[PDB]
Ligand binder design. Structure first.
Ligand SMILES: O=P(O)(O)OCCNS(=O)(=O)c1ccc(OC(F)(F)F)cc1
Ligand SMILES: O=P(O)(O)OCCNS(=O)(=O)c1ccc(OC(F)(F)F)cc1
Ligand SMILES: *Cc1c(COP(=O)(O)O)cnc(C)c1O
Ligand SMILES: *Cc1c(COP(=O)(O)O)cnc(C)c1O
Ligand SMILES: [Cl-]
Ligand SMILES: [Cl-]
Ligand SMILES: [Cl-]
Ligand SMILES: [Cl-]
Ligand SMILES: [Cl-]
Ligand SMILES: [Cl-]
Ligand SMILES: [Cl-]
Ligand SMILES: [Cl-]
Ligand SMILES: [Cl-]
Ligand SMILES: [Cl-]
Ligand SMILES: [Cl-]
Ligand SMILES: [Cl-]
Ligand SMILES: [Cl-]
Ligand SMILES: [Cl-]
Ligand SMILES: [Cl-]
Ligand SMILES: [Cl-]
Ligand SMILES: [Cl-]
Ligand SMILES: [Cl-]
Ligand SMILES: [Cl-]
Ligand SMILES: [Cl-]
Ligand SMILES: [Cl-]
Ligand SMILES: [Cl-]
Ligand SMILES: [Cs+]
Ligand SMILES: [Cs+]
Ligand SMILES: [Cs+]
Ligand SMILES: [Cs+]
Lengths: 268, 395, 395, 268
């Protein structure tokens, strides 16, 4: 949690939004994934969203489905992912690390133990994609007990009650969904979110990051202009991985370029 | 906030992305409203009778029980239009879609029967039907794929994950996550997020209601047990529902034992899996040690759903229903028995239920017992599988 | 000497070797006796209801008639156990065999459906069933052959003559000529020597009786026409029988036109063949100029019997029933139509009947008419044939 | 008809039964069939039964089914058969010739015209295998009008009424069936027929010939001893044809031997 508070405070001072890439851990292998993540950071990522490969990623479009599949083809397991996360935090003191989980991987060996492991390795937040606020109780309790921010989704059509729930229960950042559907750069969000962003601030919600379908610098700037604290980009990053599987050199170069450009767009 | 309890004890819930909660809430509202609407009920009854052929026969099987104190009846859902009980609930769900103003249907299918049921309901009622099917299933189930296409449905192969039923299920939900204002997700078993386990039960409960009336008429008393094969749980909960409060009536659910429980190659998560969260519910599932969803294996392709409906896990927990397993070989023997001695070719799924009834009888042939087996489907679709087993066997 | 008139006008008779006359006389006696026996009638009704699933639905088909003044119902014999109307009469004949003290059944089959019906009736009632099938049919109908074997029947390939249905028919009679004290010949259509045309009619007449009651209930009046596909004539005479004395009700029989009447490649002897004597009766048949029996050709394999029942030829002659033909392509279009717009996959046989109804409607869309089509069978068995036609067609 | 009367009178004087082979006309070809028939006669046949190939011979076992099939494979037609019959009679003045027909071939171009053609070519009798006495009226009338004997079947179980019908309506000879079933040497008749033979004589029936399953000299002698006027053998003759298809020489030799032996057995 507190890594986010410090980041948001600092960005506030730097007059900048946060740019936050997503990748699947272990895609396309453990070693290449670690180098990918280091590159994201070096190129200007303000925080990370990291997916643990799961057999049933039902909020993800094909780009991320395929990322899940590539990690599985390299034999990547949650245990290996947690080793990766320990190493990532061992290298980088302050950057907020958030996991993108599905429920069964959290519940599998006990919800409390899951969040305890997260705390041990230095994770800052967890978003469980198939747990709605209605089911969130044991997840958010476990998270807070272990100093993990539980990340809640605010859909573009959220009603007042849902805004108040997300505002009260959330920590770290509030996930502002661009649109309905599943992750994917091929679908840009087309709903204005400034009313949600204002109401979340009124209710003292954690700062909002816009996510889903963000693939270009103009969208980062738009999110900041609408009042959001920053933006998350997943599919567009993962597409660069997919594109460059045959050339780790070109892969990192293109990741660096893309993240650099996207982070630059976050300057107010 | 819901109208109905999303849980059966510890099992069930609504584990879907936040974006889908209004879809579930809408569908629950619509169902509750429909169940009170005499016009909706009349439309449903009209389709069940004049289109699907309800009520279905209750057939007394004399040859196979001769010389024992077992009396065995088969509830003949194999005679329903489409050749399986799945038809009952697709007609109900198609009406619910119409009630909500939707003109499009999404369905998943593994072995194909739910896709076919979804397609036929959609064709009758003028709905645009799209059906997700694992690419490995599409390749394996050409006949059912063609039936669905003949009935005007779009069949969409799914290449993600394991390219089988669970992956189809995911795709259907991904689509619904963007399309739910215009499209209804016609889920194919008594499982998934609330309200589907409740809805599918209520739209199958006529199986047990009719069974009750038929057995009272023929025998003057309730059955000692009703027995059904348990994939996700729809045909079984359809048979059980009306007897739950009749505490003298045994409710026996039969999961596929596959090559044998001890081999791990089976489809019996209720008794031999582990509880997890998937496809919107907390339920026993087939899963790896580290929580990845696994295969549900049976000689019967229709027992591919890797979990089980939450009401079954609940009824088990409180001891109201008992769950057992039957292996591939046992199911095969039951299939051959019914063909030869009663002239009915049963679904291999339903063969699991029959095999358990036959075991109840044979183990204790002097025990007086009145049993109903839910023959949920006909077995024409299975004759090639069986042929190949018998040939490879030197039989 | 017989109890009943063996002729319908000029058509019918008992053209069997002298040795078989006592068999026909015995069977006639037994039938007449059974028809007066309330116990036999109750046993028959019990099997039809609790085993085969009668009564069958009468389904109103709205989508396919929208925008016209045709109201069309389908009598759903496709929902009967076995998936075709043939089941009704095999249960009756199996009971007649039992009445006469016989424990063995002989049957012929071409496309396999009658063999399957004969096998299932025999398995239920504990009769030893042997089924003659032309070797060319055996090779072409592996699925049905296996169904018959699963149900414990012996399937005997026939290699004589043209190795198809007519040759199977001969073999069955040759066997019966030596075995009739212990074996009953369960003939599969409303044709052959007296008393079979009469018997098969009476054991199918519930189709029309139910249709009558159902249409009165739903519409408050009789249908303007009932329409059925005519092979040897059983499903059609089953539908027609109860309406014969209702002179306002049209009785329309549809023979297969095959590639077109003008091509000679068809199965419509009633209207386009020539009267001859074969398989025990005087009737229109497919035959060469010099009197050898010919092929009855249709896209539908089940329309292979090279003649037609004598009561049909009679009802035609007096103008009580009208007979028409439908070509392969017309039947195919009807098959596709029903699948897509009603979600029912019809037998290609029954597709001929549907196609004619659809023509009645389309030709004169503002004509008020209430039609029933007898959907005598389901079309699962046909999906490969249709698939292959559509593919070869670039469709 | 009258050829039979003269034959039966003469055999009565010679103290002999009649031996009467059956063959299918045109089996295995027209020319070979004509030579076969001439051989039967030369070897001692007292009369002939000749089958016109038919697509549906439902009173015949496999041996004769196969004879029908061989004639069809040689393209033999009823028209060609009638040409054969004309030639056979042109060669042999007195031997009774009986046809074994099925109903559709008789009815096909008119029953009356059929029997008129028979009369023209010199046929003496016609047996229509699938016409029972109940259906015989137009057949037997047509036959008598054209001086053709209508041959009626007397089954081994015939009741009194049937014996009287067969006795009254028949001419030429009465067919005394050995047994139920269909033609075939593989099944010998096992019912004693002497009671039928006596009752047929009492009712002034045409002389009886026993047929079905006769394949050996002892059976010919048995028929004569039981009071019958003779015996018909089909399958056993046709089997010799089937056996010897590859050698017309051996075929005729074996036919000659067999008929000679069978005719010898007819001496009282
Ligand atoms: O850029 P895109 O379009 O690929 O979207 C980024 C997705 N990565 S993520 O971890 O933020 C993320 C966040 C929420 C998700 O589902 C949920 F909303 F249902 F919870 C899925 C993924
Ligand atoms: O010697 P087999 O066993 O071949 O029998 C000889 C048969 N040849 S036949 O023309 O006399 C002959 C006579 C009667 C037949 O059928 C009928 F009785 F029904 F009329 C069939 C053939
Ligand atoms: C679909 C099917 C099953 C398994 O599904 P349930 O939801 O458990 O009923 C079993 N039997 C038959 C015949 C089926 O069609
Ligand atoms: C057998 C069959 C026919 C043809 O036989 P009929 O005796 O004329 O009824 C036609 N339709 C179906 C479905 C059949 O099964
Ligand atoms: Cl873990
Ligand atoms: Cl809560
Ligand atoms: Cl907060
Ligand atoms: Cl409950
Ligand atoms: Cl709870
Ligand atoms: Cl109500
Ligand atoms: Cl549509
Ligand atoms: Cl199609
Ligand atoms: Cl009772
Ligand atoms: Cl468990
Ligand atoms: Cl007891
Ligand atoms: Cl009449
Ligand atoms: Cl007449
Ligand atoms: Cl009565
Ligand atoms: Cl038996
Ligand atoms: Cl078998
Ligand atoms: Cl009315
Ligand atoms: Cl005609
Ligand atoms: Cl009008
Ligand atoms: Cl002629
Ligand atoms: Cl007469
Ligand atoms: Cl006389
Ligand atoms: Cs019993
Ligand atoms: Cs299960
Ligand atoms: Cs209409
Ligand atoms: Cs016909």
């Amino acid at each position: 949690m507190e890594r986010y508070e410090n980041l948001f405070a600092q960005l506030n001072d730097r007059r900048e939004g946060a740019f936050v890439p997503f990748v699947t851990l272990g895609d396309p292998g453990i070693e290449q994934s670690l180098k990918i993540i280091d590159t994201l950071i070096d190129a200007g990522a303000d925080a990370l969203e990291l997916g643990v490969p799961f057999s049933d990623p039902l909020a993800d479009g094909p780009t991320i489905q395929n990322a899940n599949l590539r990690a599985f083809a390299a034999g990547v397991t949650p245990a290996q992912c947690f080793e990766m996360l320990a190493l990532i935090r061992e290298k980088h003191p302050t950057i907020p690390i958030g996991l993108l989980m599905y429920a069964n991987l959290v519940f599998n060996n006990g919800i409390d133990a899951f969040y305890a492991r997260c705390e041990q390795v230095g994770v800052d937040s967890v978003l469980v994609a198939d747990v709605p606020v209605e089911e969130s109780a044991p997840f958010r309790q476990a998270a807070l007990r272990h100093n993990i921010a539980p990340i809640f989704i605010c859909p573009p059509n959220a009603d007042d009650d849902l805004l108040r729930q997300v505002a009260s229960y959330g920590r770290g950042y509030t996930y502002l969904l661009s649109r309905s559907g599943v992750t994917g750069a091929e679908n840009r969000g087309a709903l204005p979110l400034h009313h949600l962003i204002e109401k979340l601030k009124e209710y003292h919600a954690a700062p909002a990051l816009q996510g889903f379908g963000i693939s270009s610098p103009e969208q980062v700037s738009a999110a900041v202009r609408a009042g959001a604290a920053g933006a998350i980009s997943g599919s567009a990053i993962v597409k660069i991985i997919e594109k460059n599987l045959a050339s780790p050199k070109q892969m990192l170069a293109e990741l660096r370029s893309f993240v650099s450009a996207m982070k630059a767009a976050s300057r107010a | 906030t819901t109208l109905l309890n999303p849980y059966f004890g510890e099992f069930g819930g609504m584990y879907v992305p936040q974006i889908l909660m209004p879809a579930l809430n809408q569908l629950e509202e619509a169902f509750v409203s429909a169940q009170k609407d005499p016009e909706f009920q009349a439309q449903f009854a009209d389709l069940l009778k004049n289109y699907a052929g309800r009520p279905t026969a209750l057939t007394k099987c004399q040859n196979i029980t001769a010389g024992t104190r077992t009396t065995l009846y088969l509830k003949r859902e194999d005679l329903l239009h489409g050749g399986a009980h799945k038809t009952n609930q697709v007609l109900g769900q198609a009406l619910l879609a119409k009630r909500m103003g939707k003109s499009e249907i999404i369905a998943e299918t593994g072995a194909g029967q739910h896709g076919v049921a979804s397609a036929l309901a959609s064709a009758l009622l003028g709905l645009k039907c799209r059906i997700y099917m694992g690419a490995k299933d599409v390749e394996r189930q050409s006949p059912n794929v063609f039936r669905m296409r003949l009935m005007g449905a779009e069949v969409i192969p799914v290449h993600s994950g394991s390219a089988t039923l669970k992956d189809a299920c995911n795709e259907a939900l991904r689509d619904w996550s963007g399309s739910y204002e215009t499209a209804h997700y016609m889920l194919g078993t008594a499982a998934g997020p609330h309200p589907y386990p409740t809805i599918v039960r209520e739209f199958q409960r006529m199986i047990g209601e009719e069974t009750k009336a038929q057995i009272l008429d023929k025998e003057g008393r309730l059955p000692d047990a009703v027995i059904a094969c348990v994939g996700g749980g729809s045909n079984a909960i359809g048979m059980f529902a009306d007897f739950i409060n009749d505490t003298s009536v045994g409710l026996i659910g039969v999961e596929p034992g596959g090559h044998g429980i001890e081999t791990g190659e089976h489809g019996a998560p209720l008794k031999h899996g582990r509880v997890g969260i998937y496809f919107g519910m907390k339920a026993p599932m087939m899963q790896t040690a580290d929580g990845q969803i696994e295969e549900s294996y049976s000689i019967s392709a229709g027992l591919d759903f890797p979990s089980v409906g939450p009401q079954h896990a609940y009824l088990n927990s409180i001891g109201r229903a008992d769950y057992v397993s039957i292996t591939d070989d046992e199911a095969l023997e039951a299939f051959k028995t019914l063909c030869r001695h009663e002239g009915i070719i049963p679904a291999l799924e339903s063969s699991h239920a029959l095999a358990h009834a036959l075991k109840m009888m044979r183990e204790q042939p002097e025990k007086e017992q009145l049993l109903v087996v839910n023959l949920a489907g006909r077995g024409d679709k299975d004759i090639f599988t069986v042929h190949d087993i018998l040939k490879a066997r030197g039989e």
